[PDB]
Symmetry: D3
Subunit: 291 residues, 6 copies
C-alpha cells in the first residue's frame, strides 16, 4: 500500500468530505452479523470502523445477531428442540440460553474489539434502563399463524434515554432481548430490531451487513443486481426472493417507510465495508429510498 503515489492517497481522503458533512452529528444504525462477525480480520475491521465513525462525530449504534451460536450452545447443553414449521420453539429454557449467549458471549466480543480504540462500546438489552420493550409475535406455518414461544418484535423504544447514551460519546452494542409489558423477556429478530431502532432514533442511514454482493432481482442472473431502488418497487418484489434475503429487505422497507432516509444492504465479507459504503461511491451494496 506504500508503493502508491501520495497524490492519489490525498484524493481518496478528499473524496470523503461530502459524506462526512451529511453524517456529522447523525445516528447510523448498523446491523452486524454473518462472516463479518465470524472471521477475525473482518471483525477487527468492523470494530475499527466503529471507532472511525466515533472519532468523526458520527453516532453509530450496533445491533447484533447470533443465531448459529445459540444453536451450538443448545446442542452442547443437550437441550432437545421442538420445531413448528421450520421454527424452533423458544421455551423459557431456550430464552435463558439465547440471552446468555447473545449478551454474555457475542456482545462481549464486540464490546472488547471496539474498546481497544478507547472507552466507547457499552453492552445493552431492552432490559437495561427499560430501553425498549417487546410484543410477542406469532408466525405463519403453511397458512396457520402459530405460537413459537417467547419471541417478539420491538414494541416501544425509550428514544430519549437512548439518545442521551449516544450523546455521552458511547457506542451502544445492542443484544435484541426485551421485556413485554408484563416483564417477561422475549428474543427479537436482530434484523427487525435494527430497523425499529433506526426509526425510533431518527437515524440518517440503516446499514444491513449481509453475505451477498447486493440485491439480485432474479437471482442468479448476474446482471439483475441493482445499486439503488425505492420501496414501492422493492415491496412488489419481496415475494420472489430467496428465504435468506427476506428479513433484510423487510427491515429496509419498515425503516425507509418509517422515514429513515436510506437503508443499505452491503457485503459483510468485504473488509472495511462500512467505510466503502459511507465514504466512497464505489460501494457494491444496494440503497433503498422511499417512493
Amino acid at each position: 500500500i506504500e508503493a502508491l503515489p501520495t497524490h492519489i492517497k490525498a484524493q481518496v481522503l478528499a473524496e470523503a468530505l461530502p459524506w462526512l458533512k451529511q453524517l456529522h452529528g447523525k445516528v447510523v444504525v448498523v446491523k452486524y452479523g454473518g462472516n463479518a462477525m465470524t472471521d477475525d480480520t473482518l471483525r477487527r475491521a468492523f470494530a475499527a470502523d466503529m471507532a472511525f465513525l466515533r472519532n468523526c462525530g458520527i453516532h453509530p449504534v450496533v445491533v447484533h445477531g447470533g443465531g448459529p451460536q445459540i444453536t451450538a450452545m443448545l446442542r452442547r447443553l443437550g437441550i432437545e428442540g421442538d420445531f413448528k414449521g421450520g421454527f424452533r420453539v423458544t421455551t423459557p429454557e431456550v430464552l435463558d440460553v439465547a440471552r446468555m449467549v447473545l449478551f454474555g458471549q457475542v456482545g462481549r466480543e464486540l464490546v472488547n474489539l471496539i474498546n481497544a480504540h478507547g472507552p466507547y462500546a457499552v453492552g445493552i438489552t431492552g432490559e437495561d434502563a427499560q430501553l425498549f420493550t417487546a410484543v410477542r409475535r406469532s408466525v405463519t406455518v403453511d397458512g396457520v399463524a402459530t405460537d413459537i414461544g417467547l419471541v417478539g418484535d420491538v414494541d416501544q423504544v425509550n428514544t430519549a434515554a437512548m439518545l442521551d447514551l449516544v450523546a455521552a460519546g458511547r457506542i451502544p452494542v445492542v443484544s435484541t432481548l426485551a421485556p413485554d409489558a408484563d416483564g417477561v423477556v422475549h428474543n427479537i429478530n436482530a434484523d427487525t430490531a435494527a430497523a425499529a431502532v433506526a426509526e425510533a432514533l431518527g437515524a440518517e442511514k440503516l446499514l444491513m451487513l449481509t453475505d451477498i454482493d447486493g440485491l439480485y432481482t432474479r437471482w442468479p442472473d448476474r446482471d439483475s443486481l441493482v445499486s439503488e431502488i425505492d420501496t414501492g418497487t422493492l415491496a412488489q418484489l419481496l415475494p420472489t426472493l430467496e428465504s435468506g434475503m427476506v428479513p433484510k429487505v423487510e427491515a429496509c422497507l419498515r425503516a425507509v417507510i418509517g422515514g429513515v432516509p436510506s437503508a443499505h444492504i452491503i457485503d459483510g465479507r468485504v473488509t472495511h465495508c462500512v467505510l466503502v459504503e459511507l465514504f466512497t461511491d464505489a460501494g457494491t451494496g444496494t440503497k433503498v429510498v422511499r417512493g
Copy 2:
C-alpha cells in the same frame, strides 16, 4: 401487619430520619450474594430495597457474585476442572463460561427484578466503557504463590465515568470482569471488587450481604458476636476465622482503611436486611470503622 396501631407505625418511619439525612446524595456499594440471591422472596425484597434507596435520593451500586452458578454451568458443559490447592484454574474456556453466566444470567435476573419498579438498573462489567481494569493475581497454595489462570483484582476504576452513570439516576449492577492492561479479561472476586469500587467512588457505606448473623470472635461462642469493631482489632483477628468469613473481612478492612466511613457485615437471610441495617438501630450486623 394491619392489627398494629398506627401511632407506632409513625414512630418507625420518623426514626429513619437521621439515616436518611446522612445518606442523602451519597453512594452505597452493596455486595450481593448468598441466600438473598437464591431465595425468591429475599431476591424480590433486595430489588425493592434498591428501588427504595433510589427513590430517597441515595445512590446504590450493586456488585454481585455467583460462584456456585459458574460451577453448575461447567458441569452441564462437561468441562473438566484443574485444581491447584483448592482453586479451580481459570482457563480461557472457564473465563468465557464465567463471563456469560455472571453477566448474561445472574446480572440479568437482578436487573429485571429492580426494573419492575422503574428504569433504574443497568448491567455493566469493567469491559463496558472501560469502567475498570484488572491486574492478574497469584494465590498462595500451602506456601508457594502459584498461578491459577485469568483471575485478578481491580487495578484502576474509571471513577469519573462511574459517578456520571449514577448521577443519571441509574443503579449499576456490576459483574466482576475486567480487561488487564493488554485487553485480556479476568474474573475478579466479587467481595474484593466491591471493596475497591467503594473506595474508588468515595462511598459512604459498604454493605456485605452474608449468610451469618454477624462477626463472631471465637465461633461458635454465641456471645462472641460483636456489633461494632475497628480495623486494628479486626486485622489481628483475621488469621483465626473460618475460611468463609475471610473474604468479607478483608473487603471491610481494605474499604475502611481506604477511607470508606463504615463497612457492614449483615445477615442476607433476613428479608429487607439493607432496610434494617440503614434505617434502623436494630440491625444484627457488625460495623467496621477505622482505628
Copy 3:
C-alpha cells in the same frame, strides 16, 4: 419502641415504597395550623416530617395560618375591633399587625424548627420577588355582600419563580399576604391560599391539617365518617357542615377540581400525621378526588 421485633420494623419501611415512588420529585402543599402548630411536640414532629420529605426527593411547600395569634396581639396593642357580621374589619392598622405577626412571629418559629435539620426552610409572602398577588374579596353578611377591609384571595401566582425556589432544595414557608394590582397588601385566608398554590404549582397532593378525625357526613354520627369521597358528592354536602369545616372543604374542592390529583383532610393532633397519611394505608384522614 425497642421491644418490637425488627422483622416487622422492616415491613413498615418496605410498605412505604409505593408512596415514595408516586411522590418522588413531586410537589406537596401542606396547610399547617391548629394544635399541630400550638403544641410543641406536634410542632417538632411536623418540622421533622418536612425534613423527611426533603431528604426523600419530595418537594414540600408549607402554607400557614395564625388567626388566634393575630387576635392576641391586637388585644395587647389595645386596638379596638370593628365587626360586620362576625368578621373583623381589616383596617390598614390591623393589616400591619396581621403581617408582622404572621411573617415575623409565626413563620419564624416554623422556619427555625425545620432548619434544625439543615438549610431548607425559607420564609416568604406574595410581597417577596412578586411571588403572588391578591384580589380584594367581599363577604356575604346575612344576604348582603359587604366590605371588611384589606382581605383578599390569591389572584395570580408566579409559578415559574416558585418552582425555581423549590428546585434549589428549599422548603417555602408561606405567610398569606400579597399586594393587589396597585401594590396594596391584603391578608388572604390560609386555607384558600393553600388550595391556590397547590393548583398553580401542579402539586401531587394537598394536605389540610385540621383538629378533627376526618369528614363526618352527619356529625356527630360516629360512623358517618368517610375515608374517600369525590367532588360532586362533597359539593352537594358542603351546605350542611359545621362552620369550622367549610373552609377546609372549599379548599379541597377548588384544588381537586383545579386538577390536583387528591386533597386530604388529616388529623393534626396525631404526631407525625403527614408521615401516616403519605406513607401508610392507616391514615384516618379523608381523601378527595374528582368525579
Copy 4:
C-alpha cells in the same frame, strides 16, 4: 428640571460611564437607616436607586436597622426595660419583638417600595436557609464586660448560598437576626452586620447611610471634614468621635481591612444619595481605603 439644556444632561450621563464599568457585575452592600428610612420621599428614592443598580447589572444587598421602631413597639406593648450601662437587656421577650418589628414591619416596607419597579426584593434573616449565624457578644459598661442578653455579632456567612440568591437577579433585604450554633436567635447590630456581609461576599463597595455630611475630624470645626482617609489614620482617630459616629467607623475599618476596596459614609438626608456617591464625583461623603 426641563429648563436645562439637553447638551449638559448628556454630559452628566456620560460622566457615569467610568463608575458603571468598575461596578458592572459587582456586589454593593448598602446599610440603610436614618432619615432616608423615615422620610417618604427619601425612602422612595432609595428604593428607586436599588432598582437602578439592578437594571445596570450591579448587585445590591441591603442591610437595614430600625432601633427606634423596636423601642416604640416595646412601649406600646408595655414591656418594661432593664438597662445595664446605657444598654437595653435583650430578654427572650425583647428578641421576639425585635424580630417581628425588623422582619415583619421594617423590611416589608422596603421590600414593597423596591418591588414597585419589578420582581427584585426578597426579605431574609440569618434564620432563612441558614444564611448566617451569630455569636453572642458582651459589652463593656464603664470597665466591666457585661451580658446584655441575646445580642451578637455575625459569626459565619453562607457566602455560596448568598451569592446564588443575588445571581438570580434578587435584591436581598436583610434583617439582622441569626441563630447561634445552638439555634437560639440573636439580634445583631445592623452597622456591623453590614460590614461582615460586605467582607463575606467580596463586595466592591460598602455604603453606610448616615444623617451627617461626612466624617469630621474635630467636630464641629466645619473644615475638619475629610473626603478620603485610610484605615491607619482613621483607627487612631476613632477614640475621639461622637458616640453616634463610632458604629459606622468601626464597620468601615472592619470592612476595608477585611479587603473591601472602599467603604463610604454618605449623607442619607440627600435625595438619591447612592446615585451621587456611585456615579458622580460630587459626593459629599467620605471614602475609606486601606493603608
Copy 5:
C-alpha cells in the same frame, strides 16, 4: 460642568430609570454614519455610548455605512466609474474596494474606539459564519428598473447565531456585505441593512443617526418638525421629502411595520446623541410607531 449643584445631577440620573427598565436585556440596532462618524469628538462619544449600553445590560448592534470613503478610495485607485441614472455600477472591481474599505478601514476604526473601554466590539459581515445573505436588487432609473451590479438587500438573517454572539457580551460592528445564494458577495445599503437586522433580531428600538434635527413635513418650514408620527401617516408623506431623507424613512417603515416597537431618527451632530435619545425626554429626534 462642576459649577452645577449636585442635587440636580442626581435628578438627571434618576430620570433615566424608566428607560433603563424598558431596555434592560433588549437589543438596540444603531445605524451609524454622517458627522458622528467623521468628527473625532463625536466618534469617541459614540463609542463611549456603546460601552454605556453594554455596561447597563443593554445589547447594542452597530450597522455602519461609508459611501464617501469608498468613493475616495476608487479615485485614489484611478478606477473609472460607470453611472446609470445617478448610480455607480458595482463591478467585481468596485465590490472588492467597497468590501476592503468598509470592513478593513471603517469598521476597524469603530471596533478600536469601542475596545478602549473593554473586550466588546467584534467586526463582522454576512460572509462570517453565514450571518446573513443578500439578494440582488434592481433600481428604477427614470421609469425603467435597471441593473447596477453587485448591489443587494438583506435576504435571510441567521437570527440564532447573531443572538448567541450578542449574549456572549459582544457588540457586533456590522459591515453590510453578504453572499447571495450562489456565494457571490453583494454590497447592501446600510440604512436598509440596519432595518432588516432590527426586524430579524426582535430589537426593541432602531436608531438612525442622521445629519438633521429630525423629520420636517414641509422643509424648510421650521415648525413642520414632528417628534412622533405613525407609519400610515409617514408612508403617505414619503414621496415629498428630499432625496437625502428617503433611505432613513424607508428603513423606519420597514422596521416598525416589521414589528420593531419604535424607530428613531436622531441628530448625529449632537454629542452623545444616543444617550439623550434613550435616557432623556429632551431628544430632538423623531419617533416612528405603527398605526
Copy 6:
C-alpha cells in the same frame, strides 16, 4: 480515480484512524501562504481540508500572511517606501493599507472559500474582542537594532476567549494585526503570530505551509532533506539556511519549545497537503519535536 480497486480505497481510509484518534478534539494551528494561497485549485483544496477537520471533530485555526499583496496595493496607491536595511518602514499610512489588504481582502477570500461548505469561518484580528496584543519589535540591520515602524510580535493572547470561539464550531481566520498596550495597532509577522497562537492555545500540531519540499540541511544537496529533527539540532543549524527558511524554522522552535508537541513544515504546492500530512505517513514535510 475510479479505475482503482475499491479494496485499497478502503485501506487508505482505514489508515487514517490512528491520526483521527490523536487529533479528535484538539486544536491545529495552520499558517497559510505561498502558492497554496495564490493558485485557485490549491486554495479550494485548502478550504475543503479546513471543512474536513471541522467535520471530524478537529479544531483548526488559520493564521494567514499576504506580504506581496500589501506591496501591490502600495504601488497602486503610489505610496513611496522607506527602507532601512531591506525592510520597509511601516508608517501609519502603510499600516492602514496593510490592515485593509490583510483583513478586508485576503482574509475575506479564505472566509468565503471555507464557507461554501457551511457556517464555519469567522475573520478576526487582535483588535476584535481584544483577542491578542502586540509589542513593538526592533530589527537588526547589519549590527544595529533599528526602528522600522508599527511592526511587532504577539504579546498576550486571550486564550479563554479564543477557545470559546473554537468550541462554538467556528474556524478562526486570523489576520495578524493587534493593538499594543496603548491601543496603537501593529502588523505582526504571520509566521511568528502562528507560533504564538499555537503555544497560547495548547495546539496539538503547528502546520507551516511553505513552497518547498521540506527542510534541507545543506541546500541544494538533494539528500540533505530530513523528515524529522529535534529543536537542539535544528537550532544549531538555523544560522546556515537561506533567508526564506529562517522565519518558518524560528516559528517551529518557539512553538515546540513552548510545548506544542510537533511543528511541521509541509509543501504548500501539493494539493490537499494538510490531508497528506495529518492522515498519511507519506507526507514529504519535516517534523520538529523537542530534544
